[model samples]
Target chain A: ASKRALVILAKGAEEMETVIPVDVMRRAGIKVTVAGLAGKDPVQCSRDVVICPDASLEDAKKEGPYDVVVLPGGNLGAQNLSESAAVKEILKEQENRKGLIAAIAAGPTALLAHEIGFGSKVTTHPLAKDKMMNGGHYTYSENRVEKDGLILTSRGPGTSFEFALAIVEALNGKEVAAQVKAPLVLK
Target chain B: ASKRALVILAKGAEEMETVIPVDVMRRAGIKVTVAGLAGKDPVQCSRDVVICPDASLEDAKKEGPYDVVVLPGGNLGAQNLSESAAVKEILKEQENRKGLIAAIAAGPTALLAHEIGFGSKVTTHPLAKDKMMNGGHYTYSENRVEKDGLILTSRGPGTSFEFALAIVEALNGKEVAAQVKAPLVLK
Candidate 1:
């Protein structure tokens, strides 16, 4: 069976942060579900790109337990994700199961908002550093991509490719990740 | 007045190539219109990402004479772009006006199809090289991103950010591009 990924798509989500991982994961043969946080209507990203999700979060939740849960970040999108009770439960469940929880850019702040994965080493967009470190519950790193057990984090739009590849390597295997990565022409 | 960009979205387009440029250009403060190649319906991308466009290409053409016309690549998307009479007219007009025409991956093949920008030094995804070079109309290079006068080309998803920033620099100047680049945390 193929690995599965759940990408939470919300209004104001960073389209780059969201799309990159979804596309790259599929290239690696992972089954990805783009779940809209605000029902199934198209979501207008921070930059005005509108993406139609595969299903609503409520509907996707019924399908249950993804191999990895992805949180993409835009300032407002992360804020929206942080405020959702549904998201809180999902993150908590994933944490308890020790399944991978990956966040990028300001995404890590949502982990803080949900009080999930505290004490795991993490990283976020430099601008989000203050917000993520509010209580110093998690150690901060400036590394472009940081993985501390099940909590994986990365910084900003520029680091998105590396972030997605890391996820592929984690879910699939090094050889699969490398095979999927070669054609991307990443520098 | 702000610089404006037109990104032509076609069915089966590479979602990463499409979104990355649109997002990065918006971050640089450019006004971008995501125009659907087929009417106003949502277009399913190469990897099954669905994107709703701001307007039909016909409507966007009416609003046009944009500073840049961006062509995002997927094998099927590029073929659709290459076959559309509407797309042919747009590229021809942009070429005639000396406006920037930037394409990535298989996107460069559309240039060849339209018989536009011949003799410009160009680059494309490795798999698309023969198609882009089919008639030897354009000189080829391996540069991740290549610009020859008004025609600009890039490889695949990995070079999208650089391709987008190059367009920003061309339209908004080095200073503005640098400012936008800093926040993205680019290496």
Candidate 2:
């Protein structure tokens, strides 16, 4: 069976960050679902790009226990994710299942929201650093992609490729990730 | 008043290529209209991200003579763009008005649809090179982002930022482009 990935989309999510990983993960043959946070309505991204989700979070969760749960960031988007009771349960369940959980930019702040991974090293967008570390809960690194066990985190939109590739390696394997990256024309 | 952009969105468009330019141009304070080429319906991008357009091509054209017109590529999307008579008129008008005409990845193949910029140097996804060069009408360059007067083109998703920043630099200027680039967390 193919590995399954669930990407949570919220209003004001970074469109580029959200799209890149979703696209790349599909290239790796993962079954990916983009679940909207608010409902089935289109979610307006940080730059005002409106993306229609595959399903509402309420609908998608019932179908879960995905191989990975991914989050893409914008400040308000991450804030929405952080405040969601649904998101909290999902992450906590993924953690308990020892499944891969990935987030990029301010997205990891949601991990702080649920207190899912308290002391692992993580990275976020440079501008999001201070906010993510406001209470100094996790050790921060400047690495483009930081993976601490099942928790995979990356910086911003620019690091999305690296982040997606990391998740692919973890779920599928290095060779599969390499094959998927080959045609992307990545630098 | 701020400059305006019209991005022609087609089904099977590369979501990464499409979202990057739209997001980046909006960051430069340009008003970008994501116009659906097939109607007002949500476009199913190559990687399966569905994007709701701001308007349909028929509706958006009435407001045009936009400062720039952008096209993003997936082979099928480019084929859809190539077959649209509406797209032909839009690009021809943009070219006639001396406005910036931009495309990325397989997108440049659409430039051949109307023979809009014959003899102008351009670039495309490496895999799409032969089809783009099949007619021998346009000079092909391997540069990430190639500019030949009014025509601007770039390679695949990896070069979307360069392509988008090039569009920003053209419409707004280097200073604004630099400012926009700073927050993107690009490597």
Candidate 3:
């Protein structure tokens, strides 16, 4: 199955998290767009690795109903995402469509901003746990990859490959996910 | 101690391997330059993530000798690195200087291009093993992260984090690596 994905990129985003998923998903033959949150400009990531997005979020949404909307994590990046009204609308729409919505590390915090997931079990970067649980909005997990229905969450850069593979498994299937994983030489 | 790194980016390179090390090394406070193997322009990676390198390898080499020279992997990307006379000179210089030379996935094949690390133990993406061992000039190890002195190699995208942390430990020591690793929430 050919699935399409929208990855929202913001300033101070984790470059590893953003690139890893987008690359891995592409390896699985999924169509992915790295959409810049602020416009079609190069984003300065958390560690200052600059990445050029394919398009601006404003433009990317025109071809919407993406099977999955991926969120990458950096504390400030997540903060920017959580504060955006556009992001809330996108997440709400994805939820309403029952499409798979995913986030990694601090990316899960954005779901809380729009009250998208009230009681779903999710995971975030360890440092962001309290922030994510601040208002008793979601149950937390320590798993490297956690899936509670359409919401898929993962820990951090180290677990990003696992997260990406989980996504392939969701959209494609176990066989296709395994095929993609094999060449990666992952133990 | 401030450390500097040179990451060589070739067209068709694996975007994950390129960005992960660059991002993680910068997190460890290493000054990293994403140097284009071709010229100063955006590189279309294996997965089609267009990355604009900081400088061409020609320009970046003028500022060397860097503490570490990193190579990311893709089949064609490694092929480009392997065929470049400029890359040959850089790897040769780095090896001769006793500086750290690091690569991941299919990247180690570049070492073969320059006849580097002969008789030294290294690892690569499993698919590249026969190519790397074609001449029996090197000993192959199945390590996720192999450190045979200043030469470091790792398996694939899944091991890029390990490869990067190993570089941090080599340059900045165990404590600094630990400090950087904690925030990443890696298992």
For all candidates in order, state the fraction of native interface contacts they contain.
Answer: 0.94, 0.90, 0.80
User: Quick one: best lDDT, which candidate?
Assistant: 1
Residue A88 lDDT in model 2? Answer: 96
Model 2: CA > 4 A from native:
none
What's the candidate order when arranged by decreasing lDDT?
1, 2, 3
Weakest 10 consecutive residues, lDDT, candidate 1 chain A? A58-67
What share of the reference contacts is kept in model 3? 0.80
Candidate 3, residues B18-125: lDDT per residue as tens digits? 998888888898999999999888899999888889999999999998999999999999999999999999999998999999989999999998999898899999
TM-score of chain B of 2: 0.98
State the displacement of the C-alpha of residue A74, model 1, in Å, after optimal TM-score superposition.
0.4
DockQ, cand. 2? 0.88
- What is the number of backbone collisions in each predicted candidate, taken in the order shown? 0, 0, 0
Per-candidate TM-scores read 0.99, 0.98, 0.97
Error of 2 at B10 (Å): 0.8
lDDT of 2 by residue, B1-187 (tens): 8999999999999999999999999999999999999999999999889999999999999998899999999999999999999999999999999999999999999998788899999889999899889879989898989999999999998899999999999999999999999888788
Model 3 clash pairs are none
- For model 3 chain A, give the 10-residue run with minimal summed lDDT: A42-51
Which candidate number has the best TM-score? 1
